[PDB]
Short mmCIF file of C-alpha atoms and ligand atoms in Angstrom, two decimals:
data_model
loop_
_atom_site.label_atom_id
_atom_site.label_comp_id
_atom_site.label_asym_id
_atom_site.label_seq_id
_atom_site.Cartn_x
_atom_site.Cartn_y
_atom_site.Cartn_z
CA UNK A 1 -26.74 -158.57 5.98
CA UNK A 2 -29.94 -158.27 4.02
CA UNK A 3 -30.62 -155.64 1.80
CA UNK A 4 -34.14 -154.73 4.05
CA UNK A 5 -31.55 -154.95 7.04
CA UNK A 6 -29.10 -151.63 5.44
CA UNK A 7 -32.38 -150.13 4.48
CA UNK A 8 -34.31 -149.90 7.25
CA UNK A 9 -31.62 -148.90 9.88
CA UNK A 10 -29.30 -147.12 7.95
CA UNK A 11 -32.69 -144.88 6.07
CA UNK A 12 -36.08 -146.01 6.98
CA UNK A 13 -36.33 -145.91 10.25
CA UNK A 14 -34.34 -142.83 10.54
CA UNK A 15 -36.34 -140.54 8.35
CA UNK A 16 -39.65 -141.83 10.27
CA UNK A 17 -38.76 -141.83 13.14
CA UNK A 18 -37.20 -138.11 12.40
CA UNK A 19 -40.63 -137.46 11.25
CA UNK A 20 -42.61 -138.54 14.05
CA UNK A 21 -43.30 -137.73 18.02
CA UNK A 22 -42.53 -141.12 19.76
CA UNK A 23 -45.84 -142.08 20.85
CA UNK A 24 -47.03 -141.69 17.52
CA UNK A 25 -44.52 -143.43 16.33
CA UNK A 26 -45.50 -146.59 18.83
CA UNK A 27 -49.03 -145.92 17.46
CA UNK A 28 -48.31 -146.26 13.83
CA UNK A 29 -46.37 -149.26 14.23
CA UNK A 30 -48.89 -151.23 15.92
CA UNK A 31 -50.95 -150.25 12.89
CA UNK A 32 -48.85 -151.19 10.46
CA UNK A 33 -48.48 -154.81 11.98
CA UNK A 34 -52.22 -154.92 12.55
CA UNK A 35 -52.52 -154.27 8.60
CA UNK A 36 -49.33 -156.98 8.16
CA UNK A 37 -47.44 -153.99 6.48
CA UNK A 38 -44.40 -155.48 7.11
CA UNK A 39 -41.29 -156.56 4.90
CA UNK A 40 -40.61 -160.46 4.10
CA UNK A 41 -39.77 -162.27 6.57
CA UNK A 42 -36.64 -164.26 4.46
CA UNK A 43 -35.75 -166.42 6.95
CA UNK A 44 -36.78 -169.97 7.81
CA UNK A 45 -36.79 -171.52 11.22
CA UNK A 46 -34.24 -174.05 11.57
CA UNK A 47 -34.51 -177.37 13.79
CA UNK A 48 -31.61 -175.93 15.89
CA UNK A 49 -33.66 -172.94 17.12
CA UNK A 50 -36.65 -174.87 18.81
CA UNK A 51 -37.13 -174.60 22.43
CA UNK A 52 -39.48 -176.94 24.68
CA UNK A 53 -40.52 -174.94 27.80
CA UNK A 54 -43.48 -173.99 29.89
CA UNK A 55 -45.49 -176.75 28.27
CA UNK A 56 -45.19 -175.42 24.55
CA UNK A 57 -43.07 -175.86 21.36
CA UNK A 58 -41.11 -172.32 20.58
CA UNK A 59 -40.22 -172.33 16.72
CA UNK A 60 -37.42 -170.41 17.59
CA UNK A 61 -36.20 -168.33 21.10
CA UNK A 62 -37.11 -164.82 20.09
CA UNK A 63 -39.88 -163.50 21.66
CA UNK A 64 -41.77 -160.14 21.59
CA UNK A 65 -41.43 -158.31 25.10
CA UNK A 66 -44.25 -156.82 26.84
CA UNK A 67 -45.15 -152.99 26.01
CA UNK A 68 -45.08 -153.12 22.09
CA UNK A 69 -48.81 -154.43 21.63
CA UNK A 70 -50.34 -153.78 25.52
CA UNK A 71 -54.11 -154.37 23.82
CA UNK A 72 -53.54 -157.22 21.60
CA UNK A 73 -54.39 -155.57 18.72
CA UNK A 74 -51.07 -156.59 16.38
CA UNK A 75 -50.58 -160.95 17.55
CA UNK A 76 -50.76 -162.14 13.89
CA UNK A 77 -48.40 -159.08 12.83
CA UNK A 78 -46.22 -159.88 15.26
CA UNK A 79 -45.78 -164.06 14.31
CA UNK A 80 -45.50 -162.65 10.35
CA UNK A 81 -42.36 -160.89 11.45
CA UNK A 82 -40.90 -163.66 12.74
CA UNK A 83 -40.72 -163.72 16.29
CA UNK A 84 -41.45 -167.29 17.81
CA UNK A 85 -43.95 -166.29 20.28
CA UNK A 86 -45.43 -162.50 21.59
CA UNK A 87 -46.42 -161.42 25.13
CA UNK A 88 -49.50 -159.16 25.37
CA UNK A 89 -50.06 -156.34 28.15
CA UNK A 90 -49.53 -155.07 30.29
CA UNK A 91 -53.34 -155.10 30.47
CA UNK A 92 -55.15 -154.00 33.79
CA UNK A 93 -58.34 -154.68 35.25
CA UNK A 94 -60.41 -151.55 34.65
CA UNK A 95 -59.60 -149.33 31.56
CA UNK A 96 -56.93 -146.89 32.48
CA UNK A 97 -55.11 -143.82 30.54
CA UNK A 98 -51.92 -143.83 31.63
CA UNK A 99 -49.57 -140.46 32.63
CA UNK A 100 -49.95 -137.74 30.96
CA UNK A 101 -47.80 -137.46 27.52
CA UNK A 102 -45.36 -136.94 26.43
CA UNK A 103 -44.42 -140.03 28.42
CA UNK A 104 -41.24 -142.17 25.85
CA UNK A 105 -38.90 -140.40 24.91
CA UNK A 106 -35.72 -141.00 22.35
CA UNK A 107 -32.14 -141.35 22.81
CA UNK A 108 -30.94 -142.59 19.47
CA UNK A 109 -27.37 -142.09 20.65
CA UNK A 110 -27.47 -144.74 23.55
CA UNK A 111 -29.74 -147.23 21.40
CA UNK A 112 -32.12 -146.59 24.71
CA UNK A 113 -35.63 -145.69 25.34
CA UNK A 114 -37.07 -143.74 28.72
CA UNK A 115 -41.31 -144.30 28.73
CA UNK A 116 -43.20 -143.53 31.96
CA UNK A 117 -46.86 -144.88 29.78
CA UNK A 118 -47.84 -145.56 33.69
CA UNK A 119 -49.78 -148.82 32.48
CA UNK A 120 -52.36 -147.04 29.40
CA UNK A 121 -54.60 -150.19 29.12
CA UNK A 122 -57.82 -150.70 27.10
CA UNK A 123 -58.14 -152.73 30.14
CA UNK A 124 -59.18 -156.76 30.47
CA UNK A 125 -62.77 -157.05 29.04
CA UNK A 126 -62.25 -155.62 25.74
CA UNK A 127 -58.42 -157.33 24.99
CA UNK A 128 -60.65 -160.89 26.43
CA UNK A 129 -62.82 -159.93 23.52
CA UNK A 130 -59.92 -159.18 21.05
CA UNK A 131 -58.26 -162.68 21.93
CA UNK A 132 -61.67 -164.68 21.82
CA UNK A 133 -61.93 -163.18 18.26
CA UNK A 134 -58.99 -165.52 16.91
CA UNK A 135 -58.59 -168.24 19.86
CA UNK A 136 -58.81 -170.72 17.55
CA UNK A 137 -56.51 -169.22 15.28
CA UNK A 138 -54.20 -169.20 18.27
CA UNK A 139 -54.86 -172.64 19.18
CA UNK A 140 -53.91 -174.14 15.75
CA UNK A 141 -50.19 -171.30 16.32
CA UNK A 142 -49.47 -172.67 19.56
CA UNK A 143 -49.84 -176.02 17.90
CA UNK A 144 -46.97 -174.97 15.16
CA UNK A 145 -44.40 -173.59 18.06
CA UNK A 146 -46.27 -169.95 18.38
CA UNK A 147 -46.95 -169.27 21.68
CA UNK A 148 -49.07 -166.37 23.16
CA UNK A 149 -48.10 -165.38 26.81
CA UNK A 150 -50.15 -162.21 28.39
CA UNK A 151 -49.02 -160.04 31.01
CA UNK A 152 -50.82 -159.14 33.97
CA UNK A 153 -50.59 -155.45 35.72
CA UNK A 154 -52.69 -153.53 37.99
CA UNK A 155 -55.18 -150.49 37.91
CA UNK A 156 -53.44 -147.18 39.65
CA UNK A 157 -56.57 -146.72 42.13
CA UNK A 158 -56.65 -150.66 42.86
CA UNK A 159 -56.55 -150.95 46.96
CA UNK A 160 -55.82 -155.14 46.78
CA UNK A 161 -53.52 -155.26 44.60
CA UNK A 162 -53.38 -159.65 44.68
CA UNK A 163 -57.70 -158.83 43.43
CA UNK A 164 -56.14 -157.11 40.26
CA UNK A 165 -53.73 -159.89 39.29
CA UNK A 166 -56.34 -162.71 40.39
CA UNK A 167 -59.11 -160.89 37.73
CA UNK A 168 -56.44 -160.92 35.31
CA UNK A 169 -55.86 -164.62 35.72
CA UNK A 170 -59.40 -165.39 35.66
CA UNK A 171 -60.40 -163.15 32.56
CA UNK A 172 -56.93 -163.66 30.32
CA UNK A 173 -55.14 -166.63 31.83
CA UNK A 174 -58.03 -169.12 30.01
CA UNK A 175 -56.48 -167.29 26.51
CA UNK A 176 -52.93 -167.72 27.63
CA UNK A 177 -50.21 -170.02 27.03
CA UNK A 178 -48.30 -168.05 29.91
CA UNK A 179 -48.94 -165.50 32.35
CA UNK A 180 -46.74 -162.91 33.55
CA UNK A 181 -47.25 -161.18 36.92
CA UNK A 182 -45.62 -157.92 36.21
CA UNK A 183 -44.43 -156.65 39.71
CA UNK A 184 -41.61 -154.51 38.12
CA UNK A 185 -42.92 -151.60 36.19
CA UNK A 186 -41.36 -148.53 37.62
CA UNK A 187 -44.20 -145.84 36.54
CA UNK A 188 -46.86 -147.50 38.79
CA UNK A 189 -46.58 -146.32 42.80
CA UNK A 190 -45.75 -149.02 45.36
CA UNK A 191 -45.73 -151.93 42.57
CA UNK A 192 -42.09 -152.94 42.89
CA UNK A 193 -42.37 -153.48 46.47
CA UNK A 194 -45.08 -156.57 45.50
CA UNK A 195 -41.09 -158.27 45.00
CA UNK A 196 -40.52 -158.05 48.35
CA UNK A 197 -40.36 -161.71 50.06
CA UNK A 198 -43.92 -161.31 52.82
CA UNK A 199 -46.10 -159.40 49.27
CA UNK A 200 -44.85 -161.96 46.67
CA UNK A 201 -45.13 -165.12 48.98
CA UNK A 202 -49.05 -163.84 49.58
CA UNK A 203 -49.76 -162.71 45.68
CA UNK A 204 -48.34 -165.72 43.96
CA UNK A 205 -50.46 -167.77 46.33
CA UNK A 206 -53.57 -165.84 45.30
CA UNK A 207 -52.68 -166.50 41.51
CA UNK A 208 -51.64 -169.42 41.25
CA UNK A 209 -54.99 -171.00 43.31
CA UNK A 210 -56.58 -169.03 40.54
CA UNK A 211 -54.67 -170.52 37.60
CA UNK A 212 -54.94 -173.65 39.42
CA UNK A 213 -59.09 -173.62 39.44
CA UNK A 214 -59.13 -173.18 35.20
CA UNK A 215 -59.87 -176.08 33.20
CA UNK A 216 -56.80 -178.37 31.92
CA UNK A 217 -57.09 -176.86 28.03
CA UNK A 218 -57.55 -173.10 30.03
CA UNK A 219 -54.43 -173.87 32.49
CA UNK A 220 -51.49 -171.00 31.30
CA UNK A 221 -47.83 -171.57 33.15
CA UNK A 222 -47.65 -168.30 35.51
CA UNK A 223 -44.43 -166.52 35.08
CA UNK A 224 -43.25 -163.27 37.29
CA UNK A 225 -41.55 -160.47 35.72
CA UNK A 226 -38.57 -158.63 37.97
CA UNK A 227 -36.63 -155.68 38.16
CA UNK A 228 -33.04 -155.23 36.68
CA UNK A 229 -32.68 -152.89 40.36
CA UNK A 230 -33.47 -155.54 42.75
CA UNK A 231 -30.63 -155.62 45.71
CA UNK A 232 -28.93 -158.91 46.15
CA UNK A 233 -31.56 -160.18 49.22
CA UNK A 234 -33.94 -159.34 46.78
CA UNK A 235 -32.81 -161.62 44.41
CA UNK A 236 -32.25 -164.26 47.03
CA UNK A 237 -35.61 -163.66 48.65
CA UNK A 238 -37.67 -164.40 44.94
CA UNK A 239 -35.73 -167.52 43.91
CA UNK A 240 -36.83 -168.85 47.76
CA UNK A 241 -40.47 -167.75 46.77
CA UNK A 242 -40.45 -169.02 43.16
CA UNK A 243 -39.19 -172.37 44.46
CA UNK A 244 -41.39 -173.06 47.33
CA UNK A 245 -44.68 -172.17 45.29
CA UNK A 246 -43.58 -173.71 41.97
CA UNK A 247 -43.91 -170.55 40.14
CA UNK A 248 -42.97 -172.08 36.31
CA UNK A 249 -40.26 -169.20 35.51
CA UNK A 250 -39.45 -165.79 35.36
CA UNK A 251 -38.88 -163.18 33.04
CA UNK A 252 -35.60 -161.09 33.72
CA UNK A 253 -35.68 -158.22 33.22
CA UNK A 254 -38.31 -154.91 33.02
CA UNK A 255 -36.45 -151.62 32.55
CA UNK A 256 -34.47 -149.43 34.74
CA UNK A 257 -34.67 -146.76 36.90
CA UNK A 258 -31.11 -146.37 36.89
CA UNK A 259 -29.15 -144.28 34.51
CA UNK A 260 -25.95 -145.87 34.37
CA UNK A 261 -22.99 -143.60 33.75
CA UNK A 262 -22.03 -142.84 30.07
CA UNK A 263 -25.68 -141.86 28.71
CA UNK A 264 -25.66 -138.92 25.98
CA UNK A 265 -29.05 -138.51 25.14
CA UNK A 266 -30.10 -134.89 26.30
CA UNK A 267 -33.47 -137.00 27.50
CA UNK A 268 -31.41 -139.24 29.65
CA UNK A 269 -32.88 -137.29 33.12
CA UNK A 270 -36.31 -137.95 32.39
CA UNK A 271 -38.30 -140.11 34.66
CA UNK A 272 -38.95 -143.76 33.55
CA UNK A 273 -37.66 -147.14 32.88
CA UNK A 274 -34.71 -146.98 30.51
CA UNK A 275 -34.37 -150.03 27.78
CA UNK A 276 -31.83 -150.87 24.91
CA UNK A 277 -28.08 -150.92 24.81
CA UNK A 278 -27.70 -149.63 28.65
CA UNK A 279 -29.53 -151.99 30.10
CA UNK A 280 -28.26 -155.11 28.34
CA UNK A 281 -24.95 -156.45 30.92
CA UNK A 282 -27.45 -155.05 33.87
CA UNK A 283 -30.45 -158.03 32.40
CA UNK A 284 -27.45 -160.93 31.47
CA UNK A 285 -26.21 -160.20 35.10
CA UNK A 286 -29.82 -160.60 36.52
CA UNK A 287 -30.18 -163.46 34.45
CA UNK A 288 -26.84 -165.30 35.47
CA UNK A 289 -27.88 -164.70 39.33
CA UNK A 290 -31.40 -165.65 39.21
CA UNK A 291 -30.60 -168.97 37.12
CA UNK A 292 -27.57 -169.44 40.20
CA UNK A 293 -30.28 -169.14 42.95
CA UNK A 294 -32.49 -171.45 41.11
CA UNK A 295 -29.94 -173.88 40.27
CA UNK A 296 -30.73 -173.93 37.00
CA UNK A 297 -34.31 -175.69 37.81
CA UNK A 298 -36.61 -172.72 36.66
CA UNK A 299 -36.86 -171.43 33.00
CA UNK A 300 -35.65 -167.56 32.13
CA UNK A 301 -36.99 -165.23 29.75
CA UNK A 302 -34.16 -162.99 28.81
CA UNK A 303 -34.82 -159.50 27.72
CA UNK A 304 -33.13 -156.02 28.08
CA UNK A 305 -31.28 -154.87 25.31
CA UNK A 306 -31.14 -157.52 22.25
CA UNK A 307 -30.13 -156.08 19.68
CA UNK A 308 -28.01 -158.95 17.82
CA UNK A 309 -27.59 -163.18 18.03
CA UNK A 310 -24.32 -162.19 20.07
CA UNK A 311 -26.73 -160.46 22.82
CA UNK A 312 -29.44 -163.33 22.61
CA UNK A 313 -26.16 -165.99 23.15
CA UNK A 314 -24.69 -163.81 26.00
CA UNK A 315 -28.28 -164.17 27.61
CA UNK A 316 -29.30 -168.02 26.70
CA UNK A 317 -25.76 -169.07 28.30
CA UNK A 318 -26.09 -167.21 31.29
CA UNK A 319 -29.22 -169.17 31.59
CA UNK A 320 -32.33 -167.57 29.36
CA UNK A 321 -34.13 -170.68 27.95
CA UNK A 322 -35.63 -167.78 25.48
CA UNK A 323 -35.31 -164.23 24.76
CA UNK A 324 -37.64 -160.85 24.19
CA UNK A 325 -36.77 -158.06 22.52
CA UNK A 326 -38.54 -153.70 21.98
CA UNK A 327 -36.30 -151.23 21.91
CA UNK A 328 -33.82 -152.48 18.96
CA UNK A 329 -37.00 -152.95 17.14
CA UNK A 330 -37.56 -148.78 17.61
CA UNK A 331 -34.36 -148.40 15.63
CA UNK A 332 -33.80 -151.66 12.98
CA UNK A 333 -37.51 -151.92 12.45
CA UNK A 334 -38.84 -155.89 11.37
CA UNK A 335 -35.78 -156.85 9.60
CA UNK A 336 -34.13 -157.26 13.29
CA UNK A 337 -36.15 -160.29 13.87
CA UNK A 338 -34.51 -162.26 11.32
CA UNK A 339 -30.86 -160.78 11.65
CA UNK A 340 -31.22 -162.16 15.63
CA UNK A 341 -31.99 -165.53 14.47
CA UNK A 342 -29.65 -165.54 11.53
CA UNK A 343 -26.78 -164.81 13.62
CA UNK A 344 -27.38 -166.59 16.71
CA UNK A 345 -27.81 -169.87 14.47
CA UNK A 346 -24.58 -169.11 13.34
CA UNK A 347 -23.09 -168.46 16.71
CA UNK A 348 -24.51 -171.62 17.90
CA UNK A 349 -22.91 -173.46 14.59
CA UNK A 350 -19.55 -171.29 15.17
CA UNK A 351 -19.33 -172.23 19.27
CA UNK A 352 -20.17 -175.91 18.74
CA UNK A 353 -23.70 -176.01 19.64
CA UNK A 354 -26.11 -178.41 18.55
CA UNK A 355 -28.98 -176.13 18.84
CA UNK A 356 -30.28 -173.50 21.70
CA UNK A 357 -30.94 -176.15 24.24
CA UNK A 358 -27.70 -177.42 24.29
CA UNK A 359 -26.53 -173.67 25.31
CA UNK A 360 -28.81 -172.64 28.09
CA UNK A 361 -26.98 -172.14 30.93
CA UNK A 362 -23.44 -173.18 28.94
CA UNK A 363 -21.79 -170.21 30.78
CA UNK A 364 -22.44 -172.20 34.57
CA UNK A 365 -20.60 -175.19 33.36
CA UNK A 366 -17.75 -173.83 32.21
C1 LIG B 1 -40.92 -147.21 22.33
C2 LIG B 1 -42.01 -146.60 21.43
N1 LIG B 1 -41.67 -146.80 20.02
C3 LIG B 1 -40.92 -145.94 19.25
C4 LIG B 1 -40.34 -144.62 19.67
O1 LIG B 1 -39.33 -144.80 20.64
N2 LIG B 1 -40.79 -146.40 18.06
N3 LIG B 1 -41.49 -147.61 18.00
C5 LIG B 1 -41.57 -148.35 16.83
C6 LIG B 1 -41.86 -147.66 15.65
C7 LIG B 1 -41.90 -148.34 14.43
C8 LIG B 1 -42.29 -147.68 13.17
C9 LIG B 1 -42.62 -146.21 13.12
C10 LIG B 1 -41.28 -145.46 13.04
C11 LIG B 1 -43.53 -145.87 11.94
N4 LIG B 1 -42.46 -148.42 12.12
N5 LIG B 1 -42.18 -149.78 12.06
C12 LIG B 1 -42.38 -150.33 10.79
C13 LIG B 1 -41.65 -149.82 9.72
C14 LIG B 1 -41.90 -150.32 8.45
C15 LIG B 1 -42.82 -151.34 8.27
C16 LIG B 1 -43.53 -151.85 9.34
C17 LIG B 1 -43.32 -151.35 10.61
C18 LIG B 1 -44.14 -151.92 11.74
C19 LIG B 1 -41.73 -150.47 13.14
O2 LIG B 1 -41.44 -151.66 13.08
C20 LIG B 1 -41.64 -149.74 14.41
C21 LIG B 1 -41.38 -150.41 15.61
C22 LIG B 1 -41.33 -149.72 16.78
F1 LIG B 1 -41.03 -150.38 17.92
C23 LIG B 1 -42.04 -147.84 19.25
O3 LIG B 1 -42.75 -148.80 19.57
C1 FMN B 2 -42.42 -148.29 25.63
C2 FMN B 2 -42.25 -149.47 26.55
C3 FMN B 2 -43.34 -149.96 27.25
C4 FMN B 2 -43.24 -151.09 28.08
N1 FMN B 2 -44.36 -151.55 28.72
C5 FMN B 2 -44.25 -152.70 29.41
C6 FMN B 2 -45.40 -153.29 30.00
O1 FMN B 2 -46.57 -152.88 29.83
N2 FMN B 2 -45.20 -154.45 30.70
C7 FMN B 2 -43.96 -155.03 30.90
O2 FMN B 2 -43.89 -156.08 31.58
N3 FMN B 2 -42.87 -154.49 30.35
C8 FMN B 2 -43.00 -153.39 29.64
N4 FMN B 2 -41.88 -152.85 29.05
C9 FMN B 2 -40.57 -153.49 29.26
C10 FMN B 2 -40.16 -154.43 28.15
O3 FMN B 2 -41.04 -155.56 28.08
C11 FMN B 2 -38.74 -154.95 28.37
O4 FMN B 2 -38.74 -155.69 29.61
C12 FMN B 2 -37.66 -153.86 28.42
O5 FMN B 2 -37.99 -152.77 27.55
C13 FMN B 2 -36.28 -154.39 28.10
O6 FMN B 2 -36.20 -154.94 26.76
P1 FMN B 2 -35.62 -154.04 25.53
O7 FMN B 2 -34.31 -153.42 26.00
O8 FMN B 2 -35.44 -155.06 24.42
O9 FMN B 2 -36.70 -153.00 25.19
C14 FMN B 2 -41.98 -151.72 28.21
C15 FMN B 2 -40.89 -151.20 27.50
C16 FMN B 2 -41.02 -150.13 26.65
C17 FMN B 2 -39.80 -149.65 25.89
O1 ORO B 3 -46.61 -148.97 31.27
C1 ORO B 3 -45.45 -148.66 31.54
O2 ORO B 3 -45.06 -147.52 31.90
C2 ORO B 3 -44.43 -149.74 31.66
C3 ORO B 3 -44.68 -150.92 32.29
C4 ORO B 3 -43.61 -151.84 32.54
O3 ORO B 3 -43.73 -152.93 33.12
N1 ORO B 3 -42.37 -151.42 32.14
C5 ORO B 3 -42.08 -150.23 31.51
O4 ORO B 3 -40.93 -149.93 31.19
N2 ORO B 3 -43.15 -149.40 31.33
CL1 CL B 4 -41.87 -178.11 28.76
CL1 CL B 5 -37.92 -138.26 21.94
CL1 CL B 6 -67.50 -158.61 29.54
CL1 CL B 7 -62.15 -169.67 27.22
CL1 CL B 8 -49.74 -174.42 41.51
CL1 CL B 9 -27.31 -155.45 46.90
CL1 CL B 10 -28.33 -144.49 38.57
CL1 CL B 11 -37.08 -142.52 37.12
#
C-alpha cells in the first residue's frame, strides 16, 4: 500500500466527502480531473496487463464505467489516473435534465451508491463538439492502448426509441472506439424492456446498419450494456440475439434495482440503481452466464463492484476480457486505479498467469 492509498481512504476522501452533498461531490470531481488535479499516478503498465479486443490495444484491463464523466468533459483526466481506457455517456439525443435532485445518495457502510440522475445529458451535439476538440489527441491515445468507448442512451420524451440510439451512432459512433447501447438504466421508463428478445433483435438491427454505413477509420465496435436483474430467459434470449447479429460484446453489468438483504445504509430504500460492494457476486454471476451462453466467443466488460485486483480476477476468470470500475472510486479516490492494477498483476504472478489473456475465462476450464 501506497502512502496516497492510506491517505486518501483512510482521511481524504472522508472529510470531503463529509463535507459535501453527493452531487456536488460528482461535480467537483469531474472538475478536478478536467484541471488534472489528481495525485501521481506511480505505477507503470506492465506487458502482462495488455488486452487485444474490439479492434484496439488496452494498456491495461481497467476501464472507467459509464456515469462518472456523462459529457466528456474529464477524458484526458481520466487516462492521467491510470485507467486503460474511459467510456463516455450516457449521452442522449436532445439535451435533457434529468430527475429532480437530490437523486445519489451515500451508503458508506455498504461501499454502495443509489443515483436515480434519470439520464442528465448535455445531450449529443455539444459532447460531438467536446470530442472533435481533441480527436486527434485521441487518435494518437488509441494508438498507445487508450481507448475511448461512448455510451449511447435515450431522451425521456423520445417515441422511437431505435431513432435515439441510431442519432447517437451517427453523431458519436464516428468519435468512438466502441459504442455501448445502454438498454439497462433503471431510472428511464420502459428502457429495460428494449432487452427483451422481439425490441433488441429490431434495435441492434437499426444500429448496427448505422455503424455499418460510417467510413472504415469512423467504424466503432457496438457493444450492449445489460442488467444485473435480467431472469434466466432473459439471459438466454440476448446471447441468441448478440450471436445472430454479431453484436462485438457486451458490457455486464448496469446497477440494480434490487436491494439484496444485509444493506445498512439508512438510504438503502431509496429508488435507483444500487452499485459497489452489493452488487459485485450479482455482476461476476452475470458475467459467468453470459460468457456460458456465448461460449466464450463474445468479449465481456466486467463492472459492478471493483474495488480490488481480487474483484477484477474474480470477474476476468469468469470471463470479463476487461473491467470498469465508479463507485470504489467515490470512496478510495485516484489512488484505486493503481492499487487494482498493482494487485491484480500480482494475483496473476501469484496464480500462475502469464498475463490477463491467459486468465479470461480460466474459471470455465477448470
Ligand atoms: C456517485 C457520485 N459521486 C460521489 C458521491 O457518491 N462521489 N464521487 C466522487 C467524488 C470525488 C471527489 C470529491 C469527494 C471532491 N474527489 N476526487 C478527487 C480527490 C482528490 C483529487 C482528485 C479527485 C478527482 C475523486 O476522485 C472523486 C471521485 C468520485 F467518484 C462521485 O462521482
Ligand atoms: C452515479 C452513477 C451514474 C451512472 N450513470 C450511468 C450511465 O449514464 N450509463 C451507464 O451505462 N451506466 C451508468 N452507471 C452504471 C455504471 O457504469 C456501472 O455499470 C455500475 O455503477 C456498476 O459499477 P460500480 O459498482 O463500479 O459503480 C452509473 C453509475 C453511477 C454510480
Ligand atoms: O442516468 C442514470 O440514472 C443512470 C443510467 C444508467 O445506465 N445507470 C445508472 O445507474 N444510472
Ligand atoms: Cl481484437
Ligand atoms: Cl447521501
Ligand atoms: Cl451541430
Ligand atoms: Cl469525424
Ligand atoms: Cl454488422
Ligand atoms: Cl430466472
Ligand atoms: Cl430486492
Ligand atoms: Cl428502485
Amino acid at each position: 500500500a501506497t502512502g496516497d492509498e492510506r491517505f486518501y481512504a483512510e482521511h481524504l476522501m472522508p472529510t470531503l466527502q463529509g463535507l459535501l452533498d453527493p452531487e456536488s461531490a460528482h461535480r467537483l470531481a469531474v472538475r478536478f480531473t478536467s484541471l488534472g488535479l489528481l495525485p501521481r499516478a506511480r505505477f507503470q503498465d506492465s506487458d502482462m496487463l495488455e488486452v487485444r479486443v474490439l479492434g484496439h490495444k488496452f494498456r491495461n484491463p481497467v476501464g472507467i464505467a459509464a456515469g462518472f464523466d456523462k459529457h466528456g468533459e474529464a477524458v484526458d483526466g481520466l487516462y492521467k489516473m491510470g485507467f486503460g481506457f474511459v467510456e463516455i455517456g450516457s449521452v442522449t439525443p436532445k439535451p435533457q435534465e434529468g430527475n429532480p435532485r437530490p437523486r445519489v445518495f451515500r451508503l458508506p457502510e455498504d461501499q454502495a451508491v443509489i443515483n436515480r440522475y434519470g439520464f442528465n445529458s448535455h445531450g449529443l451535439s455539444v459532447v460531438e463538439h467536446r470530442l472533435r476538440a481533441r480527436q486527434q489527441k485521441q487518435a494518437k491515445l488509441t494508438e498507445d492502448g487508450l481507448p475511448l468507448g461512448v455510451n449511447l442512451g435515450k431522451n425521456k420524451t423520445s417515441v422511437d426509441a431505435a431513432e435515439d440510439y441510431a442519432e447517437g451512432v451517427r453523431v458519436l459512433g464516428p468519435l468512438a472506439d466502441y459504442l455501448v447501447v445502454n438498454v439497462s438504466s433503471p431510472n428511464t421508463a420502459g428502457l429495460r424492456s428494449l432487452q427483451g428478445k422481439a425490441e433488441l433483435r429490431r434495435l441492434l438491427t437499426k444500429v448496427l446498419q448505422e455503424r455499418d454505413g460510417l467510413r472504415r477509420v469512423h467504424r466503432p465496435a457496438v457493444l450492449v450494456k445489460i442488467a444485473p436483474d435480467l431472469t434466466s430467459q432473459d439471459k438466454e434470449d440476448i446471447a441468441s440475439v448478440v450471436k445472430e447479429l454479431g453484436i462485438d460484446g457486451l458490457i455486464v453489468t448496469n446497477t440494480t434495482v434490487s436491494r439484496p438483504a444485509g444493506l445498512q445504509g439508512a438510504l438503502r430504500s431509496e429508488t435507483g440503481g444500487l452499485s459497489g460492494k452489493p452488487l459485485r457476486d450479482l455482476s461476476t454471476q452475470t458475467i459467468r452466464e453470459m460468457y456460458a451462453l456465448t461460449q466464450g466467443r463474445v468479449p465481456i466488460i466486467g463492472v459492478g463492484g471493483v474495488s480490488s485486483g481480487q474483484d477484477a480476477l474474480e470477474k476476468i476468470r469468469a470471463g470479463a476480457s476487461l473491467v470498469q470500475l465508479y463507485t470504489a472510486l467515490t470512496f478510495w479516490g485516484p489512488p484505486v486505479v493503481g492499487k487494482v492494477k498493482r494487485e491484480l498483476e500480482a494475483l496473476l504472478k501469484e496464480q500462475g498467469f502469464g498475463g490477463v489473456t491467459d486468465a479470461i475465462g480460466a474459471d470455465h476450464r477448470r
